[PDB]
Amino acid sequence: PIRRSNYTPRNEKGLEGVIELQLNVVSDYLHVGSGKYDVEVMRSVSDVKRLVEDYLSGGNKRIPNNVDQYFSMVAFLMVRNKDNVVIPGSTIKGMVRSRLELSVPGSCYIVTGHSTSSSAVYKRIFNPDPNRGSDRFDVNKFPQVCPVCDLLGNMGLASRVSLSDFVMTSGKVDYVNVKGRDYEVVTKGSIFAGKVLYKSLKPVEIGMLLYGFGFVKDCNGSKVMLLGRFKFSDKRFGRVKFSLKTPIADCNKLVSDFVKQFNPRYINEE
Amino acid sequence: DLLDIATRIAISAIKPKPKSNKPEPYVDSSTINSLLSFLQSRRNVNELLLYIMRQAGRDEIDEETGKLLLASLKDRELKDAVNLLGYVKWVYDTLTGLKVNYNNVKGVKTFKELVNILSKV
Amino acid sequence: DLLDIATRIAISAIKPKPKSNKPEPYVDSSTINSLLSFLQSRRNVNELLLYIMRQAGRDEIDEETGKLLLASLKDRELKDAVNLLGYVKWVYDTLTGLKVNYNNVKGVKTFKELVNILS
Amino acid sequence: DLLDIATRIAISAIKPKPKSNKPEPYVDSSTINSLLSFLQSRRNVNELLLYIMRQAGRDEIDEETGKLLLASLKDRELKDAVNLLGYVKWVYDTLTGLKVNYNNVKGVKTFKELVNILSK
Amino acid sequence: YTFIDKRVIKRTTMIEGDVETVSPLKIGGGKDNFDPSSLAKDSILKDVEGRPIIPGSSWKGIFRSTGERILRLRNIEVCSGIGKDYCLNNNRKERDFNSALKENVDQALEIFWDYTCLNCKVFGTMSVIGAVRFLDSLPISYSLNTRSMIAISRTEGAVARRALVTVEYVDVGSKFSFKMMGYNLPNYAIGYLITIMKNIHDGFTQVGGHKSRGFGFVKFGKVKFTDLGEKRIGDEDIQVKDVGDLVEGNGDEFFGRMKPFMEAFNNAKIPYPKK
Amino acid sequence: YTFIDKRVIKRTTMIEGDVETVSPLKIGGGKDNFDPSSLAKDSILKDVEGRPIIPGSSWKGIFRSTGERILRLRNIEVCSGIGKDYCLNNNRKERDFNSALKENVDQALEIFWDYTCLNCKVFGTMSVIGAVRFLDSLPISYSLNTRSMIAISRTEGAVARRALVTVEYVDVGSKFSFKMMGYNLPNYAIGYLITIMKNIHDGFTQVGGHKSRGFGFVKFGKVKFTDLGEKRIGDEDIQVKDVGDLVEGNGDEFFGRMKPFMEAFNNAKIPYPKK
């Protein structure tokens, strides 16, 4: 069921700080799309001075030009900032919210909608609960919300938390020709780093965030998490693990408190 | 000025694609948005020219539309080219939404003429 | 003079939106304010016509209202255009506040006819 | 006469404002002065009626009050319009300053009846 | 008492800085119209020339909220500076202040010094102008990029979609022009502002929409500090060793040089709220 | 003397020029009178033709406020000018001037000369007219643009949207014709006016409605200064270097040209008020 607890005001002072995570892909095949299906022109050859567009392409149209100038064929482009592959912060927040909703017993699903597609792998790996409804609002009418909604956010209620994107410090970008078309993925050792910060949080909330970020019980190591384009219809795609790069804060006691207070349903990822 | 060029390019980019029984314009209505996004992101004109040449090679821009775009963008600044691409996008969206027929408006090189065509009907 | 054109344009624009679960105008006051602000900022009548065409193509302005706007702003000066847009905005506000029904006001050609109806 | 029309419209405009914390007229003197200033600045009747209709649509003007104003100013010259507006403003100011109760002036249609009521 | 009295400007402090977007930035353009040649339907606020300026109102709000958080951390009572909730109203001294406005000015000054908070006496409150003025920001190397989000159902249909929502933002690497102006500021107050600047620069507080998704992480590069006038303002302010009238440098060096101001602000008791 | 004597006009000065808005200027006006020319929503004191003229009254108020600030900085006894007078009613010698109005005109002249502040003589206080006269500003390349601050933000709590507000300003880059004239102005008074203008130009003083949010900032690009008449007015005047009669140019070089006037005004022992 849903635990309709009263929300915590954001102005109230709890704990404020920035924790730096370290996202690593274990299955050397991770793709998060951006809706783009064009080239990325990586080399960016500026050798049009001597020949500008081949004199307006004066009836030749016979040079490979763009094909050989750069090294990006037509594929599904991954979102990147200034030629730095980045995992969207919204994607990370959605993954964390899904994990928290499926794990915390007294949680409430945020968005349900209607069922337009079926993924039996998802329905079997994670226990479905179509009965559970959704949080309503944060106005004076129904101000009490589910603990996950209070922590992360809700419509009109902000987030005591903010999840940054994840740039890569080292890795290789590769293209894979699957389902006929071509994609863009990362390789083994492709390591991502990001800074998620918490403002005005109780320690139990910190434990909840740590549990959501893969660290089910162990502070010095997380579980494997599904994330990316293909993570159900494939075995080698969508397997990532989190790790703390600056474990400067006591964490094991916090995780123990969270699991001793909420008793979250531990789950395994295929 | 730039408005006239935009109408000529869009009207050239709305002609139906050949060898396809489906009545679709030769441009997939996302190429224009891709061009605008690429120009904004790169903030460069030569890179935009190369992107346009690649798209023309990939059988998404006809010879006439490609020639018009290259002619208009060879000697263009940054902000002026941005304005031109925005006008092109707006005109293309108008033509697509209005479901106008390329036969009805074919030899129109004046934005005023296009306005008259869209109004008098 | 300009009032009759503004009343015709507003009446054409206020007709009910099809496939709408609520009795709402086909175009909202947000579009009118956007048009007026666009004219005030850009200050280019051709750009205003292009914006009107784009809004019509975006299924925000029905084709008849778009045609009326294009005909009435085809070759107008900036001051006349802003005056007409302001008149259109005010008439739309009047119609929205009075909650008039398009089915009993569609046959209006002049401002005096609208005044007679609102009596 | 113009004064009878002015008294009638002022009476219609002095109706209590529904859903108000305090008993106050549904129409404020600021609106009347704005009407006068708008007519003086624009010097035409058409956009004056347009402004009246816009104000009526945006509350602050009773529907019957707006209807009476529109009927009165439907076909009037500029001088006649300004005379009527001045009379209306003066009558409304008298009613407000005298704190006359609406329920005692619901039946007046002329100016003489209102004068007699005020005197008595 | 020169802090409140606006008749005489005994000092003038001006901060000119550059804002570099570490994370993508999206300042809401009103989500009601897309007049210029934008990218997505939800256009950001831009000039008629297409320049995506940052409103001074956003800077003022961000600074006010960060200061509220800082003072709440320091267990210092502070007004909200919004709506009908300011400590002039909270202390029920508004009527007395209004009377003193027509009456002798010294009584009004005493009221506004004793029964008042700090944030709504620095940024300003109702019927009182703030000491600090925030200007807008004009981008230098502005870059526009867009992306889209998708709503995923939770086991109701697993993968699902209701409306393809896309957003338009400012790409990472854009550089703006940040100018903050202050009149008659106690030295400690200048520090408190520098502390707010430090919190913003370190990323503890973001700017613009989509804060939870990582939008608004900024950084200050070449930032210039100018101080002209009396150094120490008000007897209650603790004397600060002079660092000069021109402190120009990169963000780290600038903060290191401003460290005396922050330390003075930390080591200073503010009697502004009534005990 | 000649400064207060208006019977003889011995010097006429005309400062005419264009003013460019480098900030989203909004002068407001008519907030309680929403009867515009059917343009946007909020009246900004524009003529019936739709042109947002900058009121002369605002220009004066700005000039008087800036001059009061400057004089109080320079330790000059200057009061307000709203519900009182410089000395006069503020002073014990109020009815003495009224008595001397009837007979002994020279005695009244003397009373004014020794019992008034500088702004009294340059702007007029009561039954007197200032030596300077401002005019309205006509927009040349004006452009209107709206902005909405409907955002109530987190409100230091849960609610992110409670109220709504929008404003209409004048977009940047607009040009207004600025003209002001002065009669029997001594050299030091002209230098003081130039100092006020330079303070406005630099940005230390702002004109508009949302000054705290950085809305009013204007600069001069081309201003002509024509002097007709005598070079010095009173015995207290400083003999300035003869700069001619026609002074013009860009704003920076213009203010660089008026350096002798400002220098003379600063290096001028101001006799009145005697006190």
Quote the minimal CA–CA distance from A138 to chain F in Å.
7
Do residues F25 and F210 lie in contact, with contact meaning Cβ atoms separated by under 8 Å? no
Quote the minimal CA–CA distance from A258 to chain F in Å.
25
The residue length of chain C stands at 119
Quote the minimal CA–CA distance from F37 to chain D in Å.
9
* C-alpha dihedral, A156 to A159 to A165 to A166, nearest 10°: -150
Positions of chain breaks in chain B, given as the residue before each break (C to N > 2.5 Å):
none
| D64 inside 8 A of chain C by CB | no
Spatial separation of the C-alpha atoms in residues D65 and D85, rounded to whole Å: 13
Q: Which chain D residue has its CA at the smallest distance from F37's CA?
A: D42
Cα–Cα distances in angstroms (integers) from residue D66 to residues C14, C97, C106, in the given order: 22, 12, 22
Spatial separation of the C-alpha atoms in residues E116 and E270, rounded to whole Å: 11
* Three-state SS annotation for chain A: CCCCECCCCCCCCCEEEEEEEEEEECCCCCCCEEEECCCCCCCCCCCCCCCCHHHHHCCCCCCCCHHHHCCCCCCCEECECCCCEEECHHHHHHHHHHHHHHHCCCCCCCCCCCCCCCCHHHHHHCCCCCCCCCCCCCCCCCCCECHHHHHCCECCECCCEEECCEEEEECCEECCECCCCECCEECCCCEEEEEEEEEEECHHHHHHHHHHCCCCCCCCCCCEECCCCCCCCCCCCCCEEEEECCCCCCCHHHHHHHHHHCCCCCCCCC
Spatial separation of the C-alpha atoms in residues D41 and D35, rounded to whole Å: 10
Quote the minimal CA–CA distance from E65 to chain F in Å.
7
The residue length of chain B stands at 121
In 3-state terms chain D splits into helix, strand, coil percentages (rounded to 5) of 65, 0, 30
Phi, psi (rounded to 5 degrees) for A229:
-70, -60
Cα–Cα distances in angstroms (integers) from residue F32 to residues B105, C33, E231, F29, F44, in the given order: 51, 21, 43, 8, 12
Rg (CA), chain C: 14
Of B52, B99, B100, B42, whose CA–CA distance to B72 is shortest? Answer: B52
Cα–Cα distances in angstroms (integers) from residue A212 to residues A7, A97, A104, E81, in the given order: 19, 8, 9, 36
Spatial separation of the C-alpha atoms in residues F121 and E3, rounded to whole Å: 30
Touch criterion met for C and E (3+ Cβ pairs within 8 Å): yes
Element (H, E) at E134: strand E132-134
Return the partners of chain B (3 or more C-beta pairs < 8 Å). A, C, E
Residue A46 and residue B54: Cβ atoms within 8 Å? no
Spatial separation of the C-alpha atoms in residues A8 and A27, rounded to whole Å: 39
Spatial separation of the C-alpha atoms in residues F177 and F137, rounded to whole Å: 5
| E49 inside 8 A of chain B by CB | yes
Do residues F27 and F247 lie in contact, with contact meaning Cβ atoms separated by under 8 Å? no
> What number of other Cβ atoms are within 10 A of residue E230's Cβ?
12
Residue C58: strand pairing partners: none
Do residues E225 and E273 lie in contact, with contact meaning Cβ atoms separated by under 8 Å? no
Please report residues of E whose CB lies closer than 8 A to that of F206.
Answer: 133
- Give D 7-36 residues with CB within 8 A of chain F: 30, 34
Do residues A95 and E153 lie in contact, with contact meaning Cβ atoms separated by under 8 Å? no
Mutate to test the interface with B, among E34, E37, E43, E49 (most CBs of B within 10 A): E37
SS3 call for E47? coil
Spatial separation of the C-alpha atoms in residues E221 and E175, rounded to whole Å: 9
Please report residues of F whose CB lies closer than 8 A to that of D37.
Answer: 33, 35
Which of E38, E49, E145 comes nearest B41 by C-beta? E145
Return the partners of chain D (3 or more C-beta pairs < 8 Å). C, F
Spatial separation of the C-alpha atoms in residues A179 and C97, rounded to whole Å: 56
Do residues A130 and A86 lie in contact, with contact meaning Cβ atoms separated by under 8 Å? no
SS3 call for C84? helix
Strands E132-134 and E175-183: antiparallel
Residue E50 and residue B79: Cβ atoms within 8 Å? yes
Residues 6 or more apart whose Cβ sits within 8 Å of residue C50: B3, B87, B90, B91, B94, B111
For residue E20, give both structure tokens.
Answer: 């570099």
Do residues E160 and A115 lie in contact, with contact meaning Cβ atoms separated by under 8 Å? yes
Phi, psi (rounded to 5 degrees) for A236:
-90, 0
| B40 inside 8 A of chain E by CB | yes
Residue F73 and residue E10: Cβ atoms within 8 Å? yes
Please report residues of C whose CB lies closer than 8 A to that of E33.
Answer: 30, 33-34, 37-38
> What number of other Cβ atoms are within 10 A of residue E49's Cβ?
11
Touch criterion met for D and C (3+ Cβ pairs within 8 Å): yes
For residue B66, give both structure tokens.
Answer: 């490609």
For residue F31, give both structure tokens.
Answer: 């907030």
Sign (positive or negative) of CA dihedral A58, A63, A65, A69 = negative
Phi, psi (rounded to 5 degrees) for C10:
-65, -40
For residue A55, give both structure tokens.
Answer: 């004199």
Mutate to test the interface with D, among F32, F33, F34, F35 (most CBs of D within 10 A): F35
The residue length of chain A stands at 270
Spatial separation of the C-alpha atoms in residues E178 and E143, rounded to whole Å: 18
Spatial separation of the C-alpha atoms in residues F145 and A234, rounded to whole Å: 53
Residues 6 or more apart whose Cβ sits within 8 Å of residue E179: E14, E15, E16, E17, E135, F214
| A11 inside 8 A of chain E by CB | yes
Spatial separation of the C-alpha atoms in residues A109 and A129, rounded to whole Å: 9
Residue A162: strand pairing partners: A197
Residue F156 and residue E65: Cβ atoms within 8 Å? yes
| B85 inside 8 A of chain E by CB | yes
**Residues on chain B bordering chain A, Cβ-to-Cβ distance under 8 angstroms:** 34, 46-47, 49-51, 53-54, 56-58, 66-67, 70-71, 74
Residue E85: strand pairing partners: E82
Return the partners of chain C (3 or more C-beta pairs < 8 Å). B, D, E, F
SS3 call for D111? coil
Q: Which chain F residue has its CA at the smallest distance from A138's CA?
A: F158
Looking up tokens 């005020």 gives: D118
Looking up tokens 């679709």 gives: B24
Element (H, E) at C33: helix C29-42
Do residues E54 and E137 lie in contact, with contact meaning Cβ atoms separated by under 8 Å? yes
Looking up tokens 């567009």 gives: A53
Spatial separation of the C-alpha atoms in residues F4 and A263, rounded to whole Å: 88
Quote the minimal CA–CA distance from F174 to chain C in Å.
12
Do residues A191 and A23 lie in contact, with contact meaning Cβ atoms separated by under 8 Å? yes
For residue E11, give both structure tokens.
Answer: 């000092």
Quote the minimal CA–CA distance from A13 to chain F in Å.
11
| Residue E214, phi-psi category: left (phi > 0), alpha (psi -120 to 50), beta (remainder) | left
Residue B46 and residue A66: Cβ atoms within 8 Å? no
Which of C47, C57, C74 comes nearest B96 by C-beta? C57
| F164 inside 8 A of chain C by CB | no
Sign (positive or negative) of CA dihedral E253, E258, E260, E266 = negative
* Three-state SS annotation for E80-116: CCECCECHHHHCCCHHHHHHHHHCCHHHHHHHHHHCC
| C54 inside 8 A of chain B by CB | yes
Q: Which chain B residue has its CA at the smallest distance from E147's CA?
A: B37
Do residues F255 and F273 lie in contact, with contact meaning Cβ atoms separated by under 8 Å? no
Do residues E196 and E67 lie in contact, with contact meaning Cβ atoms separated by under 8 Å? yes
SS3 call for F94? coil
Phi, psi (rounded to 5 degrees) for E21:
-85, 105
Residues 6 or more apart whose Cβ sits within 8 Å of residue A134: A108, A109, A110, A111, A112
Please report residues of F whose CB lies closer than 8 A to that of E124.
Answer: 212
Please report residues of D whose CB lies closer than 8 A to that of C111.
Answer: 46, 50
